[PDB]
Amino acid sequence: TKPTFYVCPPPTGSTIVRLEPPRTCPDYHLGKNFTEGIAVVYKENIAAYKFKATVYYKDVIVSTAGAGSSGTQITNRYADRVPIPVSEITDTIDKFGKCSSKATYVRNNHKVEAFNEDKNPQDMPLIASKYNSVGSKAWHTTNDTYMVAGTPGTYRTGTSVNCIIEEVEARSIFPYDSFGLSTGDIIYMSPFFGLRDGAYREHSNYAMDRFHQFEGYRQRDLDTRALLEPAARNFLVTPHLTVGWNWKPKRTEVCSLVKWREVEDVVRDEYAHNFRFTMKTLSTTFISETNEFNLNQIHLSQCVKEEARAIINRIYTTRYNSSHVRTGDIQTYLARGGFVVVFQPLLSNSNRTITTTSSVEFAMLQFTYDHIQEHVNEMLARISSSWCQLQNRERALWSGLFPINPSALASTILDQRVKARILGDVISVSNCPELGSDTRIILQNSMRVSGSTTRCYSRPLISIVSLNGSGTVEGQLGTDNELIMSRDLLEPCVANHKRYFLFGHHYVYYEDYRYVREIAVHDVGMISTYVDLNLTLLKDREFMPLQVYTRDELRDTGLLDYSEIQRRNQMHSLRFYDIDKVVQ
Amino acid sequence: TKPTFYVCPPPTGSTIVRLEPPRTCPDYHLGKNFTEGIAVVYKENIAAYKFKATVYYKDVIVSTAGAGSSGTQITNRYADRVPIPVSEITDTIDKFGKCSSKATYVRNNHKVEAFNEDKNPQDMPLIASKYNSVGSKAWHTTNDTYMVAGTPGTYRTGTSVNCIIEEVEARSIFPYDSFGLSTGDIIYMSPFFGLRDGAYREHSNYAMDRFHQFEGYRQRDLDTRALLEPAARNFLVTPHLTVGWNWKPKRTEVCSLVKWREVEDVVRDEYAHNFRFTMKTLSTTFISETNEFNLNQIHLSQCVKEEARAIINRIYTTRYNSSHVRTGDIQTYLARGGFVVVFQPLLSNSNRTITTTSSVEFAMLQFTYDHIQEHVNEMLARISSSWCQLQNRERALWSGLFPINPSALASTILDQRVKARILGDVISVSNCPELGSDTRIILQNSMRVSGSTTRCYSRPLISIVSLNGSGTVEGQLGTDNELIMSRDLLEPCVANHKRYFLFGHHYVYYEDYRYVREIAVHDVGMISTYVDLNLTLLKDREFMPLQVYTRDELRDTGLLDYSEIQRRNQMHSLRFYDIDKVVQ
Amino acid sequence: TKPTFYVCPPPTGSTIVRLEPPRTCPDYHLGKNFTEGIAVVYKENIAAYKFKATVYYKDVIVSTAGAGSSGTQITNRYADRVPIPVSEITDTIDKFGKCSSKATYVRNNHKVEAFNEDKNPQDMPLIASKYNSVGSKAWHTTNDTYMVAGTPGTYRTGTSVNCIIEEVEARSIFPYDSFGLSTGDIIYMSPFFGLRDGAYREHSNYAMDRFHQFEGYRQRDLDTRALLEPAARNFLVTPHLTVGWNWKPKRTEVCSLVKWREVEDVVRDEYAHNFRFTMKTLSTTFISETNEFNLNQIHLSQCVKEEARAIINRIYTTRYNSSHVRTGDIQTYLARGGFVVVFQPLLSNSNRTITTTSSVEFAMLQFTYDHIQEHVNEMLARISSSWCQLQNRERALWSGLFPINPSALASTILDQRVKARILGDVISVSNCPELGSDTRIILQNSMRVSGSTTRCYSRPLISIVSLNGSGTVEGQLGTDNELIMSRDLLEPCVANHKRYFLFGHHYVYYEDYRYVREIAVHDVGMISTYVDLNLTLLKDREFMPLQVYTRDELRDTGLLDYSEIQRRNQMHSLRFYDIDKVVQ
Ligand SMILES: *[C@@H]1O[C@H](CO)[C@@H](O[C@@H]2O[C@H](CO)[C@@H](O[C@@H]3O[C@H](CO[C@H]4O[C@H](CO[C@H]5O[C@H](CO)[C@@H](O)[C@H](O)[C@@H]5O)[C@@H](O)[C@H](O[C@H]5O[C@H](CO)[C@@H](O)[C@H](O)[C@@H]5O)[C@@H]4O)[C@@H](O)[C@H](O[C@H]4O[C@H](CO)[C@@H](O)[C@H](O)[C@@H]4O)[C@@H]3O)[C@H](O)[C@H]2NC(C)=O)[C@H](O)[C@H]1NC(C)=O
Ligand SMILES: *[C@@H]1O[C@H](CO)[C@@H](O[C@@H]2O[C@H](CO)[C@@H](O[C@@H]3O[C@H](CO[C@H]4O[C@H](CO[C@H]5O[C@H](CO)[C@@H](O)[C@H](O)[C@@H]5O)[C@@H](O)[C@H](O[C@H]5O[C@H](CO)[C@@H](O)[C@H](O)[C@@H]5O)[C@@H]4O)[C@@H](O)[C@H](O[C@H]4O[C@H](CO)[C@@H](O)[C@H](O)[C@@H]4O)[C@@H]3O)[C@H](O)[C@H]2NC(C)=O)[C@H](O)[C@H]1NC(C)=O
Ligand SMILES: *[C@@H]1O[C@H](CO)[C@@H](O[C@@H]2O[C@H](CO)[C@@H](O[C@@H]3O[C@H](CO[C@H]4O[C@H](CO[C@H]5O[C@H](CO)[C@@H](O)[C@H](O)[C@@H]5O)[C@@H](O)[C@H](O[C@H]5O[C@H](CO)[C@@H](O)[C@H](O)[C@@H]5O)[C@@H]4O)[C@@H](O)[C@H](O[C@H]4O[C@H](CO)[C@@H](O)[C@H](O)[C@@H]4O)[C@@H]3O)[C@H](O)[C@H]2NC(C)=O)[C@H](O)[C@H]1NC(C)=O
Ligand SMILES: *[C@@H]1O[C@H](CO)[C@@H](O)[C@H](O)[C@H]1NC(C)=O
Ligand SMILES: *[C@@H]1O[C@H](CO)[C@@H](O)[C@H](O)[C@H]1NC(C)=O
Ligand SMILES: *[C@@H]1O[C@H](CO)[C@@H](O)[C@H](O)[C@H]1NC(C)=O
């Protein structure tokens, strides 16, 4: 309980002030030039090129067995896969669905031969393998591996020739100098090698006499026994097999870029000296330079422009035909992360390769930040602008009310207890020091004027007693604990006089110009001019490196791992034999 | 320096206005119906099924050597892996820890045999390989590869049989029609094939006589020489090895879904016609349809419901037992990205497969945007609501103060210099045009009234001189550079008269009703009614496609790459020989 | 159209209130202690160690051919790769660029030999393979595979020995106990095995006599025929090849951590009991414990401290030399996600392994949330602070204007129609009930006072008629539809009297103290004290699990898949033969 009182000497012209004129209201130069449009986004093509081929070979197996007392012992099993010559394929397999039981091939630089069962050659019917199914089909001529034992003491040799044709899956990866077959065999020729249309400049590691190409060739369907439709067919004979595949030109088969997403609602704007492609349907934003990117700098990029045009046309005439018009030709941009943006601008009526990143998350982040930034910026700019207009409006209240109570308004603006006077169009102020220690303040009981019955004091009389005996002042209780050094606040005595005057931390209650009681300030109910506004803060948050699958998991999805099998199995000599022991 | 003055004709009833009544305060219908709960989130299981098996085989190696003058030359080395028959495994390996030095097998459709060292069969002790360690263990019967040279001019043949048993790791991937062994061998039978409990309908590519199953079988621990515990054991004999493994039913061994995260604090709400699962402990939000998802549409999904229940029970009775209650049975939902949400609703006291995406980042983005949106929306709604209440409160000030200075308040509201009068409950206004060119304004020195000593002008006298000679008006200086066309602002002459009046861009200072000096407006200190508010904007930001490991890096972690080894090594014939040369 | 009127009994002292004093303005204790700095961030090294090696072997191929009537048949082709002994490499290959046409090796625990063309040994020149190119180079001694047929009825055997040297790529993965060669061969020795500097404690599975190390060894460049520069060279002879490589110590060759990013602008602060490393140039934030992390707990982490120092020095003296100073030695922290932060604090003038996560997105999220949080928090705190100051300033208007119209101000604050009086420093209020049903209100035409010509009513006379006959009151029309129960609002009659008084939902127009017409409130133009503020909300947004490449795509980039090749090709016996058929 510490009551502070004030004393207010009259204002000399020592300190004159004026009310600050209205402020110029802020301007945030938001609003950007944009352009609506359609986009097709492309990514680096990382997928192998896939096609169908057929392998033609013979399993040749030569076995030497010795018969003994106990039984038969195999002394040698020489197994070899040999290519079926093109002549056999064209004149026997594809005409009759048969294959010779004699293998005719070269090995160790010699023309050599082998006869199934060591009998005279017959053209054997090609029969579907029992595991044939939709997917992988194959045909063969025997189920047997001919070998002959004979009578004890002797070594006999027998030959097995099994003529085999498999349909296989072929794969090739950029730059397409070779292809791999699902038998494990690698073919060191481009899948696009041929004799027409410059295709003879494709890569190959084989002498030309191993390669054959037949226009309008007709392959036999071994199951239906019928001829399939004519197509240019390649045959290449390698030392272990012949491969056959239907030739297609490279131009129509591979592309280094592939469609990632076609995008109907796109807005492009100039943003930090770049182009920004905001795609609200993907919650994704891509950023390129303002310069178009020339796709001709990229190997095999021909598919993109044409395919993009067709897509964009489909878009335009389906959802934009009435509403917008195209304002130029298509444009192409290289976005951050290695994405190719193919952009068609609209208007409403009113030699490298590209490496594409593995995640578009950064571009979703980019979108999410931009969206939030744009929205809170626009809202902050409105608050800011409205606040300014509000202060400027309210100045008129301050200015209009100032003559009614200059001291009270000035004291609030200056955050300081002052006395103020109006001097024409200007305010004159003076400081009201706090009443000091060693002073006592006595409240007088009567607000009546001595010797009058019609004239009263409008506020209580007080005497200010110096406790050290300097003197006593006869003043009155002003407002807000101000003490006035005179008694010139007077009024006509009213009937039914009831007043509460603030006195320190109490209200002091008078009736009929006489003191009645002291009341605690806290005993008087409050009403509030304060409009509540309760703003709280965004709290701290820690994001964890959440993963769906670890790197270990993602490498643990396959049947076998090559390196693991090799590590374990090349030990075999070391684990089960002594490689260091030498018999003398 | 350009001073503008105004002239204000009295308001006719031509333009009467009223003060806009209080506005209805905005309502943002925020607040959503939610439901607390517990969740277990599942993901597509991509991991191979892993189990232990044992392989039983014999290395058979037949060598033919010729002795010469110089030394010995190996002419042939025929090597073959042969299966150990089940009878040998059950009656010799598992009873005695021994294996016959004679291999008895079929090859080329013939029963054939081989004798270690070409001697009579003995049951050889199985001995641990020197590389045995925790991890991979194996046993064998010899360290030698028997071969015999003999005397020059002759060819001798010798046989090595080394009986080998390895513990191996087995792997199988969905749909579990086969399994791969760490020897590289593929077994074309389900690991779950057996004779009991429908297991005989599992896939197999082998004739039944190759398969054996023994209930309560007891395998011998070759190292401790003791019998291990009884279990149903499979044996399958293939042409190169016999495999043994302990059979377990499929139901208990594999599941197509696997636990990703159990989640204690979950809130579900209806959000854009969907269910939203906000998980503040993961900073992650998942979104499904409101319809439950029936797990029975998914192959091998039985593990999920039971495991989830047990987990959820653990959660409930450990941290929620006192505080909440379960308000139903468990529910299951399919969330965006291929996550299965198993959700238990709470209340406080008061045939396909599923493909799961590789990243949950989108769901963390989803969380982060939602959290930010919810918070700034709620705060914007409070600002907006408080602002409205504030304008409505302040209207009372405008209305109450209006009779004191109608012109000044109206001029600020209309942003236009007007003169206003109160006509009862209505405001009457008129426009105050700017004083034009070709006019000069002379300030009179004296504010005293001619012929009086008790009566004065309350503001300075001015004469308005038309510079073209139209006439002179005798008026006075009003407020804010208004010029009044009369001289009826009068007051009793006070003592100590000091006034500053605004006159163009100067204050004009009078004392005792006489002009004293001109003072520049900028020479008078300001006090401000403007409460400062300094809001700045979120700045532009560019996010880069940051990667930890590129695709190249992630494929560069293994010892060998299969395709690379093949590309390089199938060239071998081409690189070091001439395959095209034919000797005649 | 429902007009409500009020009646206001005079306020007794029953309800006295006071104006709430100014509120203490909120304090948000924002502002954090930070420290500027430089960082180098490290990640788990997952890349294989790569080096160059050379393999030395001989292809030995023994062929037996039988001549017949028809032609030649190959009966056996025994092929073997044999190691070239170190003596041959040091004394013949590296001195003369030649290799013996005789292979001398061990197999089946016997010293054995082979002669190219079965002729006497010659030292054959090593010749570059025709496929030699920048990348992979190799040399050999013959292009032929010698074999001999002879005359019919006979079997002849011939031997081919082709001496081969290839440059290969070598790979090793942690913990570096072995290495893989690009021929497919695994070498079961550390690439860092040697005889110096403790290197003899590295792993090896080979007897020591297979290993050789030569200090200052000089390898021959087979193409230039010149000796290369001296270096410590290892040779290891395995049963199929000899490997040669230039030895380097492990310390300088491998590290378990690798630089991810050097970072110039870094700010560290204490945040949720942790250290926060905000990196505005990466839009990425990392979080560690406040405790430094001791790198000595990690295998092979020596490269980090030294390399980091050098990098940081480069940074400091290039961009910070004048502006800041280093305030300590370098510090190292383990951040969430498995990143190692190497941090150098600045001041302006004024045994495990670490697993690093695959994505830094969470740390970009962390940055983006922090940045947004910091900015809207700081702005909310300013709004909140300015709002409070504004209410406190405006209280002075409420307080100063209160004596002019206590009822109107109190009615707005209390949101209730009250009558208020000032009783000294306190407000006395009373409720003004709505005028009830069954009452009719008649407006009197004349505001003139009967019997006077100089005295008038200041507002219209009204009579309040009880429709049930309780009586009539003669009062007047107060403000805002208040009805006053007396007629004591009087004024001197003015000239040109024109007033509009609100009466229900009409204004009622008087001239010269006489009624003239009724005017609809909506016919009187409004001016507004309401400053507009239009805030809208962030809208709902759904983020989709966007992927650039699916898991399928990322596994579809290679030429061949090992598991696929094996699955398909180990069927071969089953698909094209009958393995179950036994010939008797
Ligand atoms: C090497 O020897 C093998 C045998 O060891 C031999 O394999 C046969 O290969 C032929 C193709 O050349 C297969 O014929 C196909 O059979 C398909 C249906 O197979 C299922 O049903 C069989 C029921 O009997 C069929 O055949 C018999 C006569 O044998 C006949 O009476 C019936 O009407 C019926 O047609 C059944 O035997 C078979 O069982 C095998 O597969 C199961 C899989 O679970 C396995 O577990 C068994 O152990 C067994 O191996 C199976 O259940 C049939 O759909 C298919 O038809 C296609 O082609 C025809 C044209 O002919 C089209 O009309 C039709 O639309 C289809 O496209 C085809 O006919 C035959 O099944 C094999 N035999 C065996 C025992 O499996 C090889 O030919 C020999 N090779 C050489 C070089 O000689
Ligand atoms: C084919 O020939 C090979 C040899 O060329 C032969 O290999 C032996 O295989 C047996 C198992 O059959 C191995 O025995 C194991 O040895 C473990 C400890 O090995 C370390 O210590 C050895 C020290 O000598 C041991 O043995 C000698 C007698 O030889 C004895 O005096 C000692 O007390 C001691 O027991 C040491 O030789 C060995 O060195 C090899 O490995 C190092 C690795 O750095 C390599 O660099 C060397 O070049 C060398 O190859 C190594 O340092 C032992 O812990 C283990 O015990 C397990 O089983 C027993 C039961 O017997 C349990 O009681 C125990 O808890 C363990 O589970 C086991 O005894 C032996 O080491 C091999 N010998 C060699 C030279 O390595 C094969 O058996 C032959 N195979 C056939 C078919 O004949
Ligand atoms: C096994 O037999 C094969 C042949 O079947 C034989 O292969 C030769 O290997 C030698 C190296 O030992 C190769 O020599 C190299 O040739 C490089 C240029 O090759 C291109 O140009 C050739 C044009 O003729 C060259 O040689 C002739 C004489 O033959 C000469 O007149 C010319 O001036 C010219 O030098 C051309 O033959 C060759 O064609 C092959 O490759 C194409 C690729 O498209 C393929 O399609 C063909 O079918 C054919 O296989 C090719 O176009 C040359 O740059 C290189 O030079 C390097 O080394 C020298 C040092 O000698 C440096 O000075 C120089 O800076 C380079 O570093 C090198 O001279 C030769 O090309 C092979 N021959 C053939 C036919 O390809 C093996 O040697 C035999 N091995 C054994 C053990 O005997
Ligand atoms: C008492 O105090 C007053 C002011 O507080 C001072 O002016 C005066 O000198 C003091 N009187 C005595 C007697 O000390
Ligand atoms: C001078 O100007 C006044 C108004 O500015 C105009 O009314 C008057 O016609 C002018 N007088 C002459 C003589 O042109
Ligand atoms: C008429 O109404 C008044 C107040 O509305 C009530 O006091 C009075 O009793 C009523 N008079 C009659 C006759 O019912």
Residue numbers in the entry:
A (entry chain A), B (entry chain A), C (entry chain A): 115 to 464, 503 to 736
How is this structure described in the published paper?
Varicella-zoster virus (VZV) is a highly infectious, human host restricted alphaherpesvirus that causes varicella (chickenpox), establishes latency in sensory ganglion neurons and can reactivate to manifest as zoster (shingles). Herpesvirus virions have an outer lipid membrane studded with glycoproteins that enable fusion with cell membranes to initiate entry and establish infection. The most conserved herpesvirus protein, glycoprotein B (gB), is classified as a type III fusogen due to its structural similarities with vesicular stomatitis virus (VSV) G protein and baculovirus gp64. In contrast to these fusogens, gB requires additional virally encoded glycoproteins, gH and gL, which are implicated in membrane binding and priming of the gB trimer, to induce membrane fusion.
The VZV gB ectodomain was composed of five domains, DI to DV, with 13 helices and 31 β-strands, similar to herpesvirus orthologue structures in their postfusion conformations. Each protomer was stabilized by five disulfide bonds, conserved among alpha-, beta-, and gammaherpesviruses. C122/C584 stabilized the non-contiguous regions of DIV (N-terminal, aa115-136 and C-terminal, aa570-681) and C139/C540 bridged the distal end of the long central helix of DIII (α8) with the linker to DII.
